[PDB]
Design a protein around this ligand. Structure first.
Ligand SMILES: *SCCS(=O)(=O)O
Ligand SMILES: *SCCS(=O)(=O)O
Length: 106
């Protein structure tokens, strides 16, 4: 519910600017992706449990260009950002690790 959809390359660069010193979690997923749908409700629920963390969403079908530049091979892929810089990443619909990575990098 506190997740925002990134529908353009500019909205992506903007969100990372507007976050300040907060951690940014990006979910690179697609509408046809099986495991992506399995972990999606969990992602959204974490966003209303972490006021300190910015939760974002990229759709790789619309953003093939963006997905490629971020070296996304499979989905869901979660990438984590402090300031402008990437501070960590992992791939796969893993509920426990997603939470653990948020707790660690916050
Ligand atoms: S991330 C979306 C890329 S595009 O819709 O501007 O082509
Ligand atoms: S994941 C971000 C890719 S790029 O814009 O830094 O090249």
């Amino acid at each position: 519910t506190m997740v925002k959809q990134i529908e353009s390359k500019t909205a992506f660069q903007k969100a990372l600017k507007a976050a300040g010193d907060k951690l940014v979690v990006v979910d690179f997923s697609a509408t046809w992706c099986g495991p992506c749908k399995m972990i999606k409700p969990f992602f959204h629920s974490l966003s209303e449990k972490y006021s300190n963390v910015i939760f974002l969403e990229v759709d790789v079908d619309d953003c093939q260009d963006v997905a490629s530049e971020c070296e996304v091979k499979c989905m869901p892929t979660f990438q984590f950002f402090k300031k402008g810089q990437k501070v960590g990443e992992f791939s796969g619909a893993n509920k426990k690790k997603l939470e653990a990575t948020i707790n660690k990098l916050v």
